[PDB]
């Protein structure tokens, strides 16, 4: 990252900060890593995050400078389509089946994170067009 | 038998 | 390999059998395993096995157990358990075999409805039901003259009865005339008084079989029923271990004495009667003879039974009971009389209306007839006791055959029967602590049931598989002539007994010699009891059993002189008495040998006949609704030998599927160009691909056969490719979600 | 399915029947007549030979022989005869599809067993045979695996001690004195009284005559002194014809022959002492259970008081404290068949039969080594 970038991370970092300390939780640490173009897994986001324990994970706060190399590290298509298609073969999906295993394997989300996701991409039918929601997920 | 008796 | 981090293994537990492990880390190749429980374990991995896998979920539950992947005791085990505790149903497709656990509970499964949703389905489709067995045999019967067979075995209280009363009230349901069945139920009373006796394990253990044939015009309108009986337990009429009784007949008969009629019978109680006495316990709890002896006259009666012929039968009993108090002084070493005036043996002579001196003269002599000459002389009072046992043994045993005779009459019907279905109620395999002539011979039965259904399964097998057009090699048979060939074959156990039986100064130490001199070391299946020079053991195929020796020479003696038998017939006060023998070779013969003649007549019956089998379960003893015990069904699927009915399956090709519905599971696996719009040869393709061994499985030209370990892998690669498209979709689809909250931010 | 055929030869009677039955379903004379006289009446079906009770009802006009003499078979083509007859004839059942169980007594030429095996392998082709001891199948028949046995038919009288189920082989002893030669002494003491059986047809009367009036002494010397004093003890008898015959001593004094055979000439000891020889020839542990149990076997025991003359004068010769015991159970006549029916039936007996694939490969010696 360029001192330009530095800037634009650190302002967005601080934004995130709900205590004014200038530091972030580390629950948080995932959530502004996915906001600046990261998709990283839980699974990534606890090792970049060192696997805290619940209390440090829930109340620790770090800065900046700390959470930095965690986004560097973890900064460090046609998958995500073949993906779609496993739940396809005609270009569709059912708003039911993504809700259940969105919300059932995995790292499992919340039912408004899938509905909020999902707003706007099935039809009447209950189908979505997979690539094109992609194409939006991606954006 | 054959010697010492009749049969 | 199998064995990964998080996968899931049963380890044995003595408290219940098998216990659900976590592998906690993965197996590498010997000592251990690191084990992880519902806590966690290290646990010794010994000389070898590893233990057994266990089947992904989804198999779990389904209605036969061949489909499960991995086919081994405590799968199956499961499998009954959750179907049973959690979804509460009873009836389960082992195979061919309906496997029914016995609820303890009335149900609702049972009605018109039900029965309208079964006729004319084939058995896959709906889940199984005792129904959907009588449904198969109905239509069988249809397609094919052939008569049709059901069999049903287990542990009495298993409840063989309720599931042949069942069947029996399908057939009455699907096509109608008329009153047969009820007929045919309100039989059971005084077939149980007649033919069940307390056993240690168990009451009301039936000691016979009993095969009921329905017969049927030729639109399949219930004609009527009629009855037989085969392997008669007769030594328990004059001998008894402790804690056995005698039939239940004699207790119900002593505990009435009291009654008007029964005062001419001179009836005690039942400690006083020889036959009673042996056994130790006249009363049973819970079960209380008096009131017992309603129901079976009462049964008598409405199967009409005249009031003159049931005094007659207790008028028998009552003589069997007092014949055994009669007792002999020996006089010399080689001869005996009866004392004097004997009480016992005047009421005997009185009851049965005979001379007292010449049941007098003939107990204590045998009458020897040359060609113009005749000797009457003495015998020993060993001999005049096996005598009178044996005479008690011959009254008894044609008693039954009277009874069930009329009780035929009852339910004949005089239009003749085209065709018939015959169910048959037959003891399980027993084990006890102590095994004696009886156990050996009920487990005899029942290796030669197990061989016939190990036939009829071979050969259904070996014709789907041709039907699919595979070589039939792949199925091997698995054969237990050879310990048939133990027992019943010549210079076998039971031809050493009968041997032994007319040998100068036979006893069981002398046969028990010949047995090891014959068998010890020239069979596999035969071996000695480290300790003892008195029993042996016999590998059946459910287990081993020790059997002792010591009194298989009292139990197997029968012989009859005709000249006790010549003084009863001419006994002129009552009809039934000369009407039972009303009828040399015979009255030589052993138990042992009329044992193995009646079976014959079973297999014989049998095979006429195409099967289908029930087996029964009884999950728990205390007779508690709806539970289930690991240790003690665990015993009776060996008893019934399903465990080995599903070993011999699990060696083989226990899954089976279609070309339809394996694809619709796995396009998951497919690649797209990979996926032709033909089902057959893509899926040809990728299971070469997927799995080495075509040696694993086999094309059926409409279905595709694996052996046991292939459908775990097809569900555990679906599962890891399924769990990563997920992971690799739901962090993108979080990575929008930060997006909305840079949304937020912003406001 | 197929049971062996017990056949015993004897003398005087064949007794014959299928085992593992209760009694012979046939018994008749060993005894083969040829017609003397010359035939007058033409067209008559007359007939080369008579068998066994065929010869009894004629025998007036027929010469009587006996084919068996002292347990020896002196003629063969006669016991031929007699083996048809009795497989046709008796049992009509075809000797091709039975076992055949034959008996023998003990100590006599070998030669005897080599030709009955080789006439029933070759002309009946009877399937298996055996050849057995006759005092063995007494103890089979009298429940017993321990005994010494005294055997008497028509001919020889032998005994043999057994122990536990072996023999004592040095032991066994032989005698020729019993049943026919009893006879043939009744008559010259008949002579004595004033009638002549000579002819072979008339033994067969002396021997009815013996056989219904005859019984053994308690003691010799008073039953002489009192029929010398008495008439009391003398009984009548009825020839065929309708006369009537009076015996008085002979009835008695014929079989006390037995117990002092000095009457007929014979040197031997009589039965009593030859079976008190025996058992002194065995070693004395087993002594104390062969005085416990004597076995008395075969027709030529059956008269009245031998079993009483017999434990008396053995406990007259015997130790003084053990006890003398004589078992004879009024079956006995039959006891050899009895216990051969026994021992063909039993499954442990089924491999010791000689087959007739061993008589092919190895000829009539094989009979030596497998039998006894
Ligand atoms: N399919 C079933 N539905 C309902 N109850 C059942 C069923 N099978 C068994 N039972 C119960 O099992 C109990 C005992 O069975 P039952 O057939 O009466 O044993 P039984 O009288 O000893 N006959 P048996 O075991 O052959 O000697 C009864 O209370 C039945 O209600
Ligand atoms: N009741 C009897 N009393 C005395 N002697 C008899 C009696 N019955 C048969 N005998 C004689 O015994 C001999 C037959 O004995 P048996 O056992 O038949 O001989 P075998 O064993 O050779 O056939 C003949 O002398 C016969 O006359
Ligand atoms: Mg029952
Ligand atoms: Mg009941
Ligand atoms: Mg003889």
């Known amino acids: 990252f360029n001192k330009d970038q530095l800037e634009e991370f650190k302002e967005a970092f601080e934004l995130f900060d709900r205590v004014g300390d200038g530091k972030i939780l580390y629950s948080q640490c995932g959530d502004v890593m996915r906001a600046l173009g990261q998709n990283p897994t839980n699974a990534e986001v606890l090792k970049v995050l060192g696997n805290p324990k619940s209390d440090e994970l829930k109340s620790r706060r770090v800065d900046f400078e700390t959470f930095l190399p965690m986004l560097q590290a973890v900064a460090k298509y046609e998958d995500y389509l073949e993906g779609f298609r496993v739940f396809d073969g005609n270009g569709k999906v059912m708003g039911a089946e993504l809700r259940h295993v969105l919300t059932t394997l995995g790292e499992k989300m919340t039912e408004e994170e899938v509905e909020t996701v999902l707003a706007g991409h099935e039809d009447s039918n209950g189908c979505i067009n997979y690539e094109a929601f992609l194409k939006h997920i991606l954006s | 038998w054959x010697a010492x008796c009749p049969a | ?512 010699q010949k047995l090891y001199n014959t068998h010890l070391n020239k069979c596999a299946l035969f071996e000695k009891p480290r300790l003892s020079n008195k029993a042996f053991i016999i590998k059946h195929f459910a287990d081993k059993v020790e059997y002792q020796c010591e009194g298989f020479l009292e139990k197997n003696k029968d012989t009859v002189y005709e000249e006790q038998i010549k003084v009863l017939k001419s006994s002129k006060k009552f009809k039934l008495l000369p009407e039972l023998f009303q009828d040399s070779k015979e009255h030589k013969k052993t138990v042992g040998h009329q044992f193995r003649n009646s079976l014959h007549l079973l297999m014989e ?69 990979d996926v032709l719009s033909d089902r057959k040869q893509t899926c040809k393709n990728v299971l070469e691909k997927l799995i080495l061994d075509k040696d694993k499985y086999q094309f059926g030209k409409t279905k595709i056969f694996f052996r046991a370990g292939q459908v775990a892998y097809l569900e555990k690669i679906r599962a890891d490719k399924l769990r990563a498209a997920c992971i690799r979709i739901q962090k993108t689809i979080r990575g929008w979600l930060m997006r909305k909250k840079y949304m937020r931010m912003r406001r | 399915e197929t049971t062996a055929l017990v056949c015993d030869n004897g003398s005087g009677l064949v007794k014959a029947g299928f085992a593992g039955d209760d009694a012979p379903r046939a018994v008749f004379p060993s005894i083969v007549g040829r017609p003397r006289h010359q035939g007058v009446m033409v067209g008559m079906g007359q007939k080369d030979s008579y068998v066994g009770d065929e010869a009894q009802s004629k025998r007036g006009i027929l010469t009587l022989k006996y084919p068996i003499e002292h347990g020896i078979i002196t003629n063969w083509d006669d016991m031929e005869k007699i083996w048809h007859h009795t497989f046709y004839n008796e049992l009509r059942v075809a000797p091709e599809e039975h076992p055949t169980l034959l008996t023998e007594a003990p100590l006599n030429p070998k030669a005897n067993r080599e030709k009955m095996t080789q006439i029933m392998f070759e002309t009946f082709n009877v399937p298996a045979m055996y050849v057995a001891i006759q005092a063995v199948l007494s103890l089979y028949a009298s429940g017993r695996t321990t005994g010494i046995v005294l055997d008497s038919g028509d001919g020889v009288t032998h005994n043999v001690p057994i122990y536990e189920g072996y023999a004592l082989p040095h032991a066994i002893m032989r005698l020729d004195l ?152 009024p079956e006995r006549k039959y006891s050899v068949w009895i216990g051969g029916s026994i021992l063909a039936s039993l499954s442990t007996f089924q491999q010791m039969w000689i087959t007739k694939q061993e008589y092919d490969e190895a000829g009539p010696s094989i009979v030596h080594r497998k039998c006894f």
């Open chain 3, 1 to 512: 390999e199998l064995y990964t981090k998080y996968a899931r293994v049963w380890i044995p537990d003595p408290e219940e059998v098998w216990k659900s492990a976590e592998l906690l880390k993965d197996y590498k190749p010997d000592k251990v395993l690191q084990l992880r429980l519902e806590k966690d374990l290290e646990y010794c991995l010994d000389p070898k096995e590893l233990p057994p896998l266990r089947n992904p979920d989804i198999l779990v539950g389904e209605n036969d157990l061949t489909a499960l992947s991995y086919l081994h005791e405590p799968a199956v085990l499961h499998n009954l358990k959750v179907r049973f505790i959690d979804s509460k149903l009873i009836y389960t497709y082992c195979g061919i075999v309906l496997v029914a656990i016995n609820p303890y509970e009335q149900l609702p499964i049972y009605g018109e409805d039900i029965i309208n949703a079964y006729s004319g389905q084939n058995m896959g489709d709906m889940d199984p039901h005792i129904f959907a067995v009588a449904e198969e045999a109905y239509k069988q019967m249809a397609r094919d003259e052939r008569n049709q067979s059901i069999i049903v075995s287990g542990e009495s209280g298993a409840g063989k009865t309720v599931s042949a009363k069942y069947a029996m009230r399908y057939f009455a349901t699907v096509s109608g005339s008329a009153n047969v069945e009820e007929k045919v139920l309100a039989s059971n009373p005084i077939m149980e008084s007649i033919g069940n006796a307390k056993t240690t394990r168990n009451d009301n253990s039936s000691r016979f079989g009993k095969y009921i044939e329905i017969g049927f015009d030729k639109r399949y309108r219930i004609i009527g029923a009629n009855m037989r009986t085969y392997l008669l337990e007769k030594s328990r009429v004059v001998f008894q271990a402790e804690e056995e009784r005698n039939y239940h007949i004699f207790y119900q008969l002593c505990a009435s004495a009291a009654l008007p009629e029964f005062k001419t019978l001179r009836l005690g109680n039942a400690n006083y009667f020889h036959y009673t006495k042996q056994g130790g316990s006249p009363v049973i709890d819970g079960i209380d003879d008096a009131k017992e002896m309603v129901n079976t006259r009462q049964a008598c009666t409405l199967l009409g039974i005249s009031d003159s012929y049931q005094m007659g039968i207790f008028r028998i009993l009552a003589g069997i009971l007092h014949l055994g108090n009669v007792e002999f002084a020996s006089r010399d070493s080689d001869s005996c009389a009866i004392p004097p005036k004997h009480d016992p043996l005047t009421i005997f002579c009185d009851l049965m209306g005979v001379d007292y001196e010449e049941m007098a003269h003939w107990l204590c002599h045998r009458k020897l007839a040359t060609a113009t000459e005749t000797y009457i002389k003495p015998i020993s009072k060993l001999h005049a006791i096996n005598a009178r046992d044996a005479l008690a043994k011959h009254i008894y045993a044609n008693l039954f055959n009277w009874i069930v005779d009329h009780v035929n009459k009852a339910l004949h019907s005089t239009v003749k029967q085209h065709s018939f279905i015959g169910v048959l109620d037959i003891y399980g395999f027993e084990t006890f602590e102590i095994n004696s002539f009886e156990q050996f011979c009920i487990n005899y039965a029942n290796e030669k049931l197990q061989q016939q259904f190990n036939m009829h399964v071979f050969k259904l097998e070996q014709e789907e598989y041709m039907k699919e057009q595979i070589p039939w090699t792949l199925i091997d048979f698995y054969d237990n002539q050879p310990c048939i060939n133990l027992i019943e074959a010549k210079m076998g156990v039971l031809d050493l007994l009968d041997e032994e039986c007319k040998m100068p100064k036979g006893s069981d130490d002398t046969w028990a």
């Open chain 4, 178 to 329: 019993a049943g026919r030669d009893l006879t043939d002494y009744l008559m010259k003491i008949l002579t004595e009284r004033g009638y002549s059986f000579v002819t072979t047809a008339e033994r067969e009367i002396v021997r009815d005559i013996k056989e219904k009036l005859c019984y053994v002494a308690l003691d010799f010397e008073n039953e002489m002194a009192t029929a010398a004093s008495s008439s009391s003890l003398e009984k009548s008898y009825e020839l065929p014809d309708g006369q009537v015959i009076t015996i008085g001593n002979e009835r008695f004094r014929c079989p006390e022959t037995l117990f002092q055979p000095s009457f007929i000439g014979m040197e031997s000891a009589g039965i009593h002492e030859t079976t008190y020889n025996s058992i002194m020839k065995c070693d004395i542990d087993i002594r104390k259970d062969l005085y416990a149990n004597n076995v008395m076997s075969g027709g030529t025991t059956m008269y009245p008081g031998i079993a009483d003359r017999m434990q008396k004068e053995i406990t007259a010769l015997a130790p003084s404290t053990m006890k003398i015991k004589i078992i004879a159970p």
């Open chain 3, 605 to 673: 019956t049998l095979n006429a006949t195409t099967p289908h089998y029930v087996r029964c379960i009884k999950p728990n003893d205390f007779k508690f609704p709806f539970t289930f015990d690991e240790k003690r069904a665990v015993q009776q699927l060996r008893a019934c030998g399903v465990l080995e009915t599903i070993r011999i399956s699990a060696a083989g090709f226990p899954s089976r599927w279609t070309y339809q519905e394996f694809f619709s599971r796995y396009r998951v696996l497919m690649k797209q160009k």
